[PDB]
Amino acid sequence: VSNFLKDFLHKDRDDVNVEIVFLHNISPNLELEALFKRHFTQVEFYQGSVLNPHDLARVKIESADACLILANKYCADPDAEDASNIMRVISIKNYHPKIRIITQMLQYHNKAHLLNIPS
Amino acid sequence: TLGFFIASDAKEVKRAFFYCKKKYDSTGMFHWCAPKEIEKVILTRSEAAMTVLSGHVVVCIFGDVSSALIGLRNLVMPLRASNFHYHELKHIVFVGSIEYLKREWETLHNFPKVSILPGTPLSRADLRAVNINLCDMCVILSANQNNIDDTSLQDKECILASLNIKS
Ligand SMILES: [Ca+2]
Ligand SMILES: [Mg+2]
């Protein structure tokens, strides 16, 4: 989150009025809460999985500009983490297919699996 | 005798007695062919493309050596039931890993109209080879469904194969 937020809120980038709404089922620790309290006016957090359409309507993903998915690079199974990202893009496209998903994969064949989704 | 009724309640059903004003198997019920060969039923993509299959049945399987044996004999039995004719009997092709197909072929040999395509059910080229478009019904089965312990893997393959076929 820190490496993402510095690149997203950097002075060199044009001023951004866009807010950032996180969504993660694990409740954050005190240091992540302190990071949110730092970038208070620009970021909000909301606990929940992405595999719940009630959670997606709660974070207003249909009214959201673009969804982003950050993959765990350092994982013990580069296919299982790939699979979790697959299921996340599946759930977001199942709720609202008219949204822009910016995600990150771990191989090249998984790009075809992403292409399998109709939207 | 007794009458099998399909009404919406028990009390509605409780009105009938109240208101009164070789070519087959060794048994007969199925079809049996001689034990064929795994090399006879393995096809390649070009051979399956030249094999014209219209209205047929394709079965997708996500099986491996670590996966449990599903058991497909119960699946393929009422396809070869003798309530139709041999010309009416559909053709079946199995798409998946040849390891799981070898693990199950020792059960799967006494049945006609059965092919095997080793490969991957996610392969769009393999689906175009087996003509899923003309295929009457694609059946997507999963074998690793009771060894994986996560919704992320739970039916993940089945969902991908369905979405690829729809796309
Ligand atoms: Ca009822
Ligand atoms: Mg705010």
From Swiss-Prot, chain A:
Tissue occurrence: Widely expressed. Except in myocytes, it is almost ubiquitously expressed.
Other known facts: The protein was initially thought to contain two functionally distinct parts: The core channel (from the N-terminus to the S9 segment) that mediates the channel activity, and the cytoplasmic tail (from the S9 segment to the C-terminus) that mediates the calcium sensing. The situation is however more complex, since the core channel also contains binding sites for Ca(2+) and Mg(2+).
Function recorded in the entry: Potassium channel activated by both membrane depolarization or increase in cytosolic Ca(2+) that mediates export of K(+). It is also activated by the concentration of cytosolic Mg(2+). Its activation dampens the excitatory events that elevate the cytosolic Ca(2+) concentration and/or depolarize the cell membrane. It therefore contributes to repolarization of the membrane potential.
Family: Belongs to the potassium channel family. Calcium-activated (TC 1.A.1.3) subfamily. KCa1.1/KCNMA1 sub-subfamily.
Annotated binding of Mg(2+), by residue: 19, 42, 44
Compartments reported by the entry: Cell membrane
Disease: Paroxysmal non-kinesigenic dyskinesia 3 with or without generalized epilepsy: An autosomal dominant neurologic disorder characterized by absence seizures, generalized tonic-clonic seizures, paroxysmal nonkinesigenic dyskinesia and involuntary dystonic or choreiform movements. Onset is usually in childhood. Patients may have seizures only, dyskinesia only, or both. Epilepsy, idiopathic generalized 16: An autosomal dominant form of idiopathic generalized epilepsy, a disorder characterized by recurring generalized seizures in the absence of detectable brain lesions and/or metabolic abnormalities. Generalized seizures arise diffusely and simultaneously from both hemispheres of the brain. Seizure types include juvenile myoclonic seizures, absence seizures, and generalized tonic-clonic seizures. EIG16 is characterized by onset of seizures soon after birth or in the first years of life.
Outcome following mutation: residue 14 to G: In PNKD3; may have a synergistic effect with ethanol in the triggering of symptoms
Processing after translation: Phosphorylated. Phosphorylation by kinases such as PKA and/or PKG. In smooth muscles, phosphorylation affects its activity.
Name the UniProt record assigns to this protein: Calcium-activated potassium channel subunit alpha-1
Domain RCK N-terminal: 1-119
Domain-related comment: The S0 segment is essential for the modulation by the accessory beta subunits KCNMB1, KCNMB2, KCNMB3 and KCNMB4. The S4 segment, which is characterized by a series of positively charged amino acids at every third position, is part of the voltage-sensor.
Curated annotation (Swiss-Prot), chain B:
Function field: Potassium channel activated by both membrane depolarization or increase in cytosolic Ca(2+) that mediates export of K(+). It is also activated by the concentration of cytosolic Mg(2+). Its activation dampens the excitatory events that elevate the cytosolic Ca(2+) concentration and/or depolarize the cell membrane. It therefore contributes to repolarization of the membrane potential.
General remark: The protein was initially thought to contain two functionally distinct parts: The core channel (from the N-terminus to the S9 segment) that mediates the channel activity, and the cytoplasmic tail (from the S9 segment to the C-terminus) that mediates the calcium sensing. The situation is however more complex, since the core channel also contains binding sites for Ca(2+) and Mg(2+).
Region: Segment S9, residue numbers: 52-72
Tissues/organs with expression: Widely expressed. Except in myocytes, it is almost ubiquitously expressed.
UniProt PTM: Phosphorylated. Phosphorylation by kinases such as PKA and/or PKG. In smooth muscles, phosphorylation affects its activity.
Lineage start: Eukaryota, Metazoa, Chordata, Craniata, Vertebrata
Cellular localisation: Cell membrane
Segment forming the signal sequence: none
Domain comment as written in the entry: The S0 segment is essential for the modulation by the accessory beta subunits KCNMB1, KCNMB2, KCNMB3 and KCNMB4. The S4 segment, which is characterized by a series of positively charged amino acids at every third position, is part of the voltage-sensor.
Disease: Paroxysmal non-kinesigenic dyskinesia 3 with or without generalized epilepsy: An autosomal dominant neurologic disorder characterized by absence seizures, generalized tonic-clonic seizures, paroxysmal nonkinesigenic dyskinesia and involuntary dystonic or choreiform movements. Onset is usually in childhood. Patients may have seizures only, dyskinesia only, or both.
Species annotation: Homo sapiens (Human)
Subunit structure: Homotetramer; which constitutes the calcium-activated potassium channel. Interacts with RAB11B. Interacts with beta subunits KCNMB1, KCNMB2, KCNMB3 and KCNMB4. Interacts with gamma subunits LRRC26, LRRC38, LRRC52 and LRRC55. Beta and gamma subunits are accessory, and modulate its activity.
RCK N-terminal domain: residues covered: 54-167
Residues of the full protein shown: 658 to 952 of 1236
Protein name listed in UniProt: Calcium-activated potassium channel subunit alpha-1
Protein family according to the UniProt entry: Belongs to the potassium channel family. Calcium-activated (TC 1.A.1.3) subfamily. KCa1.1/KCNMA1 sub-subfamily.
